[PDB]
Amino acid sequence: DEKVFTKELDQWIEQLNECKQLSESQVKSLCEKAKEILTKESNVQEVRCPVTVCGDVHGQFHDLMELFRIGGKSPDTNYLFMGDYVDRGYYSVETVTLLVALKVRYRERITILRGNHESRQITQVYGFYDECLRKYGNANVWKYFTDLFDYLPLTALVDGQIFCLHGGLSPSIDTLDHIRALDRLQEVPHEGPMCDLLWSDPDDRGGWGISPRGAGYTFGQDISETFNHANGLTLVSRAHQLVMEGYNWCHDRNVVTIFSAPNYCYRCGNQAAIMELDDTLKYSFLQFDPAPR
Amino acid sequence: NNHSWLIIQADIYFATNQYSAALHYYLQAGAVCSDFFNKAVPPDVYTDQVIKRMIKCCSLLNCHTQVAILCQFLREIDYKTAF
Amino acid sequence: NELKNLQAEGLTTLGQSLRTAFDLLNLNRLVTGIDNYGQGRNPFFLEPAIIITITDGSKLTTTSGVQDELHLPL
Numbered sequence: 001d002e003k004v005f006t007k008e009l010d011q012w013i014e015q016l017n018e019c020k021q022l023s024e025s026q027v028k029s030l031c032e033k034a035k036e037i038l039t040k041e042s043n044v045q046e047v048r049c050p051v052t053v054c055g056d057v058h059g060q061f062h063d064l065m066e067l068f069r070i071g072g073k074s075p076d077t078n079y080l081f082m083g084d085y086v087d088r089g090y091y092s093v094e095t096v097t098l099l100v101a102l103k104v105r106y107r108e109r110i111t112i113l114r115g116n117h118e119s120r121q122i123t124q125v126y127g128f129y130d131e132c133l134r135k136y137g138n139a140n141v142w143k144y145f146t147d148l149f150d151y152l153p154l155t156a157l158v159d160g161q162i163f164c165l166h167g168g169l170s171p172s173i174d175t176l177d178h179i180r181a182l183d184r185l186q187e188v189p190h191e192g193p194m195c196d197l198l199w200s201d202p203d204d205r206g207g208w209g210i211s212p213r214g215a216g217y218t219f220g221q222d223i224s225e226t227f228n229h230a231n232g233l234t235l236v237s238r239a240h241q242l243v244m245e246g247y248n249w250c251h252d253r254n255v256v257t258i259f260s261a262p263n264y265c266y267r268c269g270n271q272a273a274i275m276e277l278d279d280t281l282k283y284s285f286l287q288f289d290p291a292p293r
Numbered sequence: 294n295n296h297s298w299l300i301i302q303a304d305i306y307f308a309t310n311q312y313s314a315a316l317h318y319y320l321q322a323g324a325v326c327s328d329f330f331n332k333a334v335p336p337d338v339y340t341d342q343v344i345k346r347m348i349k350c351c352s353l354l355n356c357h358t359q360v361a362i363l364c365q366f367l368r369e370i371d372y373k374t375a376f
Numbered sequence: 377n378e379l380k381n382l383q384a385e386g387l388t389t390l391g392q393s394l395r396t397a398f399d400l401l402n403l404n405r406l407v408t409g410i411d412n413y414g415q416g417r418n419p420f421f422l423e424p425a426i427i428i429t430i431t432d433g434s435k436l437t438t439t440s441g442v443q444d445e446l447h448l449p450l
């Protein structure tokens with residue numbers, strides 16, 4: 001049973017890498033195994049060094065393939081994706097299918113987090129629902145992928161020292177034990193700890209503030225310093241805003257923005273970047289251009 | 294274990310410019326009347342005069358955060374001596 | 377930018393701040409000659425202004441002690 005599913009899933013990886021969509025029953029089985037493998041995973045999953053952390057993909061599949069050509073193939077280099085790989089891109093189902101199949105194939109080598117775009121309402125309004133209707137035909141595969149987004153872990157921890165999440169901090173979160181105590185098994189609300197986890201963003205302020213997004217908050221250097229000191233952390237990695245250079249060290253070498261989708265929405269022209277934590281926590285930046293088409 | 298006699302001893306030490314012993318016996322009287330400060334000290338032992346004398350004893354021993362905390366204790370908070 | 381970069385690390389000195397705000401506004405008022413002294417009071421010469429003090433209601437504090445009643449400096 002393990003051998004036949006392993007070789008079938010490897011053929012699924014090979015068929016995904018050449019940009020071919022799967023079938024509905026194959027997505028059914030992939031999503032069911034993904035549900036089984038993601039049930040036994042905490043809100044703060046400890047990812048051991050080394051790991052190559054990548055940021056937002058947002059359904060740019062050829063850019064994802066280039067990313068695998070830069071940082072290394074998925075069997076050989078560890079990856080940690082901070083969500084938001086589903087909307088604002090032409091090839092959306094292939095990207096999420098490749099990530100989920102790589103997760104269920106390599107359970108210690110691919111870590112997948114949850115973004116704010118990976119919810120029912122946002123996928124319904126910003127494009128994944130339409131892509132679902134135009135390729136697979138009905139809205140049922142969107143139902144499996146929304147449940148799969150529902151089970152995804154929120155944050156991740158690298159060697160007890162680097163905190164990786166999609167959005168930003170929270171006025172209601174003070175310790176990492178509160179992250180592990182949240183009920184993750186629900187769609188992201190309009191108010192609460194987890195909406196702020198997936199929606200907040202840093203800014204050069206002196207305190208909290210209403211984010212110009214309709215949800216989440218915004219935080220400054222004092223808040224980030226307090227969170228890093230009170231939790232034994234030294235770095236907060238996140239991927240929520242478009243960056244030209246692909247990386248930002250804001251809040252005085254404490255908060256790191258890593259955007260990994262070059263030419264966002266195919267009209268912005270940003271040079272994306274990813275971070276490569278070695279076995280000595282001894283990092284480097286891989287900065288790349290969009291793929292030829 | 295008689296609080297009034299301890300207050301008298303503390304006042305005699307305070308009059309003879311022995312601030313450490315006066316503070317010791319004031320604290321000792323507070324520990325007699327309340328069960329080692331488990332309940333609140335009654336106002337007939339730590340009067341405003343007694344707390345003010347304790348504040349003066351802390352001030353002349355160059356312990357100023359203790360002066361601020363100890364002058365929160367009064368019925369009206371003495372902000373001038375705190376500052 | 378100056379709104380989002382405020383740090384609350386001072387005393388509750390309401391009178392001096394209120395006098396400073398009024399001094400700014402009345403300063404430009406008397407610069408422009410909006411108020412014609414001696415020639416009457418013309419309410420058509422008008423510079424509409426609303427000032428909003430957002431505070432907490434704590435005790436009024438100076439460097440010497442707490443002040444019970446609010447007096448503007450003269």
Ligand SMILES: [Mn+2]
Nearest residue numbers: 058084085117
């Ligand atoms: Mn995204």
Ligand SMILES: [Mn+2]
Nearest residue numbers: 084115116240
């Ligand atoms: Mn996002």
